[PDB]
Design an enzyme around this catalytic site. Structure first.
Site, mmCIF file in Angstrom:
data_model
loop_
_atom_site.group_PDB
_atom_site.id
_atom_site.type_symbol
_atom_site.label_atom_id
_atom_site.label_comp_id
_atom_site.label_asym_id
_atom_site.label_seq_id
_atom_site.Cartn_x
_atom_site.Cartn_y
_atom_site.Cartn_z
ATOM 1 N N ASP A 1 0.956 -1.236 -0.047
ATOM 2 C CA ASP A 1 0.073 0.003 -0.097
ATOM 3 C C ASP A 1 0.725 1.241 -0.185
ATOM 4 O OD1 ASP A 1 -3.230 0.815 0.547
ATOM 5 O OD2 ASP A 1 -1.520 2.199 1.781
ATOM 6 N N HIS B 1 -11.182 -19.940 13.687
ATOM 7 C CA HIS B 1 -11.635 -21.065 13.403
ATOM 8 C C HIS B 1 -10.627 -22.126 12.398
ATOM 9 C CE1 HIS B 1 -14.351 -24.316 11.746
ATOM 10 N NE2 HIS B 1 -13.694 -24.479 10.880
ATOM 11 N N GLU B 2 -10.259 -21.102 11.481
ATOM 12 C CA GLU B 2 -9.171 -21.566 10.363
ATOM 13 C C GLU B 2 -8.130 -21.643 11.045
ATOM 14 O OE1 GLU B 2 -10.585 -22.785 7.869
ATOM 15 O OE2 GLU B 2 -12.430 -21.868 7.963
ATOM 16 N N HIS C 1 -7.389 -24.772 13.088
ATOM 17 C CA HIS C 1 -6.917 -25.991 12.158
ATOM 18 C C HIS C 1 -5.431 -26.314 12.220
ATOM 19 C CE1 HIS C 1 -10.481 -27.456 10.928
ATOM 20 N NE2 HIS C 1 -11.230 -26.342 10.289
ATOM 21 N N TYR D 1 -8.798 -35.670 9.110
ATOM 22 C CA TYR D 1 -9.923 -34.973 8.755
ATOM 23 C C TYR D 1 -10.988 -35.562 7.916
ATOM 24 C CZ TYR D 1 -12.246 -30.371 7.645
ATOM 25 O OH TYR D 1 -13.036 -29.164 7.681
ATOM 26 N N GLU E 1 -13.225 -30.370 13.649
ATOM 27 C CA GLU E 1 -14.163 -29.245 13.079
ATOM 28 C C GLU E 1 -14.615 -28.525 14.354
ATOM 29 O OE1 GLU E 1 -15.623 -27.227 10.550
ATOM 30 O OE2 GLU E 1 -13.690 -27.908 9.910
ATOM 31 N N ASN F 1 -19.787 -8.370 20.265
ATOM 32 C CA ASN F 1 -20.992 -9.212 19.806
ATOM 33 C C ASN F 1 -20.821 -10.418 19.984
ATOM 34 O OD1 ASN F 1 -22.545 -6.688 19.337
ATOM 35 N ND2 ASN F 1 -21.356 -6.287 17.580
ATOM 36 N N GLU G 1 -22.661 -18.823 17.916
ATOM 37 C CA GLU G 1 -23.224 -19.190 16.491
ATOM 38 C C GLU G 1 -21.864 -19.259 15.768
ATOM 39 O OE1 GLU G 1 -26.938 -19.416 15.460
ATOM 40 O OE2 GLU G 1 -26.368 -19.992 17.661
ATOM 41 N N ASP H 1 -19.284 -34.751 2.748
ATOM 42 C CA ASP H 1 -18.478 -33.779 3.729
ATOM 43 C C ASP H 1 -17.516 -34.891 4.559
ATOM 44 O OD1 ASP H 1 -18.007 -31.512 5.153
ATOM 45 O OD2 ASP H 1 -19.285 -32.183 6.517
ATOM 46 N N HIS I 1 -18.358 -31.301 9.248
ATOM 47 C CA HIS I 1 -19.169 -30.308 9.347
ATOM 48 C C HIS I 1 -20.589 -30.452 10.136
ATOM 49 C CE1 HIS I 1 -16.167 -28.897 6.421
ATOM 50 N NE2 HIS I 1 -16.204 -27.786 7.095
HETATM 51 N N1 LIG Z 1 -17.240 -25.585 4.432
HETATM 52 C C1 LIG Z 1 -17.110 -24.616 4.956
HETATM 53 O O1 LIG Z 1 -18.119 -23.456 4.884
HETATM 54 C C2 LIG Z 1 -16.297 -24.392 6.323
HETATM 55 C C3 LIG Z 1 -15.455 -22.929 6.150
HETATM 56 C C4 LIG Z 1 -16.013 -21.997 7.292
HETATM 57 C C5 LIG Z 1 -15.423 -22.295 8.687
HETATM 58 C C6 LIG Z 1 -15.911 -21.669 9.585
HETATM 59 C C7 LIG Z 1 -16.901 -20.720 9.167
HETATM 60 C C8 LIG Z 1 -17.264 -20.104 7.867
HETATM 61 C C9 LIG Z 1 -16.885 -21.048 7.098
HETATM 62 C C10 LIG Z 1 -15.158 -25.564 6.042
HETATM 63 N N2 LIG Z 1 -14.365 -25.233 7.154
HETATM 64 O O2 LIG Z 1 -14.890 -25.253 8.428
HETATM 65 O O3 LIG Z 1 -12.865 -25.444 6.873
HETATM 66 CA CA LIG Z 2 -19.739 -16.220 16.377
HETATM 67 CA CA LIG Z 3 -3.985 3.127 0.761
HETATM 68 CA CA LIG Z 4 -20.824 -12.570 16.906
HETATM 69 ZN ZN LIG Z 5 -13.243 -26.100 9.557
#
Ligand SMILES: NC(=O)[C@H](Cc1ccccc1)C[N+](=O)[O-]
Ligand SMILES: [Ca+2]
Ligand SMILES: [Ca+2]
Ligand SMILES: [Ca+2]
Ligand SMILES: [Zn+2]
Ligand SMILES: [Ca+2]
EC number: 3.4.24.27
Length: 316
Positions: free
Chosen positions: A57, A142-143, A146, A157, A166, A183, A187, A226, A231
């Site tokens: 940038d 979350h990612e 992993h 997996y 997961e 927030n 969820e 899946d 998931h």
């Molecule tokens: N397939 C998906 O939508 C998942 C991706 C995702 C994981 C957490 C939140 C939103 C999307 C696969 N995963 O949990 O690695």
């Molecule tokens: Ca959340």
């Molecule tokens: Ca810029």
């Molecule tokens: Ca939230």
């Molecule tokens: Zn995942």
């Protein structure tokens, strides 16, 4: 790259302003030198060749709409790094401050995000089902989780070990969200899921069934889709974790909640000292019981709650 640490300012996917750690060397790069061996964010430029180019940038201001996904991927990777370090004394995902790299603007209208074994990858969503996924802190955590799992338990997996994999990511993604304390909820992905619909999410830990996911072992998916429902069946473990922390009565079984912090301590320990690549649900119960035992004592309320939680979801 080699340069001097600076602080830029920008706006994330949800239009919120935040400061980000950058590096100056002719251009201002999304390279945070303040955490471990650095956090690097790249631009995939709507293609799929990874990682793409380190985000450059000209003025250290990141307010363009194109900048938004990068701002959040960078910032939230930092928040997640802080969580593991300050809460679990873990330095980066490998425990030795490995560089954390993320790529945004992956492909076109890509409704997903993932860890490819070496880095984070975020699609921009199609604008209907998803908006840039790096906008969700629970998605980012979350990612990255992993990566932590791959370096520790190494849960395969697929099938039950995959469902646990997961769930661990949903659990810590949620705990990181509560950590940032903006927030928070139980969820998954509500901040970037379906901008046109209010109050929904991709998954629910408090009530997996809300989106068709099982909340009891007797309702587990045994098909091949899946990767054997990683998931899907994750809902069974997500529900147990939710109960351990918040408590409640599920299918007639009452669970005394012990709070999020203890939930995190128990599961982090199970993940790093007891779970293996082939651990199944029953083995997860044992690992959690042993973890709670080490941490709070075999006669503790904590151990009793872990048992009640798994009993409630039908896992023996
Ligand atoms: N397939 C998906 O939508 C998942 C991706 C995702 C994981 C957490 C939140 C939103 C999307 C696969 N995963 O949990 O690695
Ligand atoms: Ca959340
Ligand atoms: Ca810029
Ligand atoms: Ca939230
Ligand atoms: Zn995942
Ligand atoms: Ca929505």
């Amino acid at each position: 790259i080699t340069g001097t640490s600076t602080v830029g300012v920008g706006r994330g996917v949800l239009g919120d302003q935040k400061n980000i750690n950058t590096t100056y060397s002719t251009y201002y790069y999304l390279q945070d030198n303040t955490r471990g061996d650095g956090i690097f964010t790249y631009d995939a430029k709507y293609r799929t060749t990874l990682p793409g180019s380190l985000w450059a940038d000209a003025d250290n201001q990141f307010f363009a709409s194109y900048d938004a996904p990068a701002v959040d991927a960078h910032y939230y990777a930092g928040v997640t790094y802080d969580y593991y370090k300050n809460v679990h004394n873990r330095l980066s995902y490998d425990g030795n401050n490995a560089a954390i790299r993320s790529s945004v603007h992956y492909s076109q209208g890509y409704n997903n995000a993932f860890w490819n074994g070496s880095e984070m990858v975020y699609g921009d969503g199609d604008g209907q089902t998803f908006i840039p996924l790096s906008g969700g802190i629970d998605v980012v955590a979350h990612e990255l989780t992993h990566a932590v799992t791959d370096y520790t338990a190494g849960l395969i997996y697929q099938n039950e070990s995959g469902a646990i994999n997961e769930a661990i990511s949903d659990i810590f993604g949620t705990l990181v969200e509560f950590y940032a304390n903006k927030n928070p909820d139980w969820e998954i992905g509500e901040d970037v899921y379906t901008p046109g619909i209010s109050g929904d999410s991709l998954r629910s830990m408090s009530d997996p069934a809300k989106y068709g996911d099982p909340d009891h072992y007797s309702k587990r998916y045994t098909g091949t889709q899946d990767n054997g429902g990683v998931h899907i069946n994750s809902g069974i473990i997500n529900k147990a974790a939710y109960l351990i922390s918040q408590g409640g009565t599920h299918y007639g079984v009452s669970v005394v909640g012990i709070g999020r912090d203890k939930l995190g301590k128990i599961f982090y320990r199970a993940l790093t000292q007891y779970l293996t690549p082939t651990s199944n649900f029953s083995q997860l119960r044992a690992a959690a019981v042993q973890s709670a035992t080490d941490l709070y004592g075999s006669t503790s309320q904590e151990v009793a709650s872990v048992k009640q939680a798994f009993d409630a979801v039908g896992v023996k």
